[PDB]
Design a protein around this ligand. Sequence first.
Ligand code: NAD
Ligand code: NAD
Lengths: 321, 321
Amino acid sequence: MKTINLSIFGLGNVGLNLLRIIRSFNEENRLGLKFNVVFVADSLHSYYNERIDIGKVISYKEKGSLDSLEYESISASEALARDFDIVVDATPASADGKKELAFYKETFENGKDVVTANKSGLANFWPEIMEYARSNNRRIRYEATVAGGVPLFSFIDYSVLPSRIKKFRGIVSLTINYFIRELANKREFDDVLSEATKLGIVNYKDDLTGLDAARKSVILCNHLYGSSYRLSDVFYEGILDRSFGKNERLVTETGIVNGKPSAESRIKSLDSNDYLLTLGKGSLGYQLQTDTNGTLNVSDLYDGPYETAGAVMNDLVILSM
Amino acid sequence: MKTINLSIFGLGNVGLNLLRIIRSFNEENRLGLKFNVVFVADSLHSYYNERIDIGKVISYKEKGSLDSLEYESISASEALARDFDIVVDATPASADGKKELAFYKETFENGKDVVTANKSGLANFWPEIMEYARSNNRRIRYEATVAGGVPLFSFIDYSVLPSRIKKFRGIVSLTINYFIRELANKREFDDVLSEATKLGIVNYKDDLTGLDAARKSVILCNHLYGSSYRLSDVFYEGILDRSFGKNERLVTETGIVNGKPSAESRIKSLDSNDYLLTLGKGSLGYQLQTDTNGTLNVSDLYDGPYETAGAVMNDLVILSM
Ligand SMILES: NC(=O)c1ccc[n+]([C@@H]2O[C@H](COP(=O)([O-])OP(=O)(O)OC[C@H]3O[C@@H](n4cnc5c(N)ncnc54)[C@H](O)[C@@H]3O)[C@@H](O)[C@H]2O)c1
Ligand SMILES: NC(=O)c1ccc[n+]([C@@H]2O[C@H](COP(=O)([O-])OP(=O)(O)OC[C@H]3O[C@@H](n4cnc5c(N)ncnc54)[C@H](O)[C@@H]3O)[C@@H](O)[C@H]2O)c1
């Protein structure tokens, strides 16, 4: 009954599952919403139509066959100037966040909101993105940038409204924690890495230096405390010679320390009854300590891109409803 | 900056902590909200004022000294007819739900919304309460009726919007589970009960027959599936002669079974790695399996009335923001 129009940038693990979800949601939902797609782009294609056939785009991407499509081809900038409501950024994260910054600037100025799974602009240029949003009276949500499909920003925004002090501890970076836990099994780094490569588990540098965790901690700290931090404002460390205990994890923590928001990702030996120790190697989870709503433990069972796309979709519904 | 006016019915473990929270929230919040209280009632007092002094009401209730107050005394019905926005029901749960039904009817017809921690009207007269709300274009929220201060209805309503099949399993009834676990320690019923009484842990009939769980399951199932069930539509059981295993809990489950919403509270021996087995005796928690947002585990560490009042307060903010 209410139609919301989208331009989707990126058709990979997240983007392609988002298309599948949008299709099912359109057919099934009890929210009175319909999401129409007017534009899809990947690294090779940039297709516009008043009513993109989503099933066709899915089927042709699955067959490696978007080459075969009839649609208008227009550049990202032209697409932002066409009539629609929301941009979805499911593209690769740049090293410096500049491309994401420029893209959100142009999106906002063209009068559209942003939902992003890409953390790069937010981790490097948060106050600039927020200024461009405010300036243009637009909004951005970023559920999927931290803790994938486990509700986190919607949880903070709608479930614990009365709490003022919130403090966060979590496993939000899985690959480095996989490596730590395997090394704690008394395996050699080279053997863990070799197998992880064959399994598709891991250029693994950003993960294993703790930088992935650091980028997420910027977004989390800024959202929680209204800080305007970038990467240099947070602490992080990684694993790139020593042995690891069974109770060691790279834990990401944010809170107010000495009157100042603080964010850190550190390798710690946890107490044997710590909630975070209970999480499986594929499980994202966190403990959120609040002053009015107690201390809450939240996690999923198995992280994956379908659930991640489901977080993007929750943001899309929040913005629309 | 935006002022919302409340009438608070009940000044006990929940009600009195709600007053304390409202005071701190008014002083501290970054949401641009202020909650003003125009009316408070307990079993002895029914005080109205354009601007009730909350600190005074707290201090006089703590001293057992509301007798000493100057304010207008008016009946609940007169209070509902005065100008305000929301009624908070933090009163005792009736056996049959009729008093709660009549009270919400009069609240809605007088043009005010309801936030309730009392489960009784909802467990017995859900479709009637919902019809009276719809009829009068009013709203009711009930976060605190099931799983206390652990976000549950706000979680469903704002964090997993895209998911259609949701299925729920949880420990939502703590006292019966306390008794089960103590009995699993090879103690005698009479000794558990005697100690529990001295400790203030437990007329314990509704808890130990599983009826408390059953009432909560009605509310949960109706919220999840849009059913209009009452107590006779759900299954439940209790402990009121045999021995109990270490892995037995009274688990409350809801889901679609054979195309029909189903809700059951049953004593089950859980598999040793079940999430629900990880919860402490003071911990409410649940696992929510969804088709678009994965399977989510959520719990608190220690249930209590302050956190429960914090759930009431989250409902108040949702209704107002
Ligand atoms: N579960 C996850 O995979 C997960 C979880 C959280 C966040 N993310 C983030 O979501 C984003 C997408 O991840 P993914 O796994 O889908 O990546 P992917 O590599 O599977 O897909 C990237 C997609 O973007 C496309 N693309 C590349 N350059 C483009 C351009 N200039 N314009 C439009 N499209 C372009 C690619 O062709 C591909 O379709 C990343 O920034 C990632 O960090 C992913
Ligand atoms: N943490 C918890 O204690 C908890 C958790 C979930 C739900 N609840 C529910 O919240 C409600 C309140 O629980 P509580 O622990 O605060 O109970 P309580 O017994 O501590 O307080 C009940 C309050 O209601 C007052 N009251 C009694 N009759 C009244 C009337 N006719 N009008 C106005 N006030 C009246 C009492 O004097 C008292 O102030 C109950 O329905 C309970 O089932 C409580």
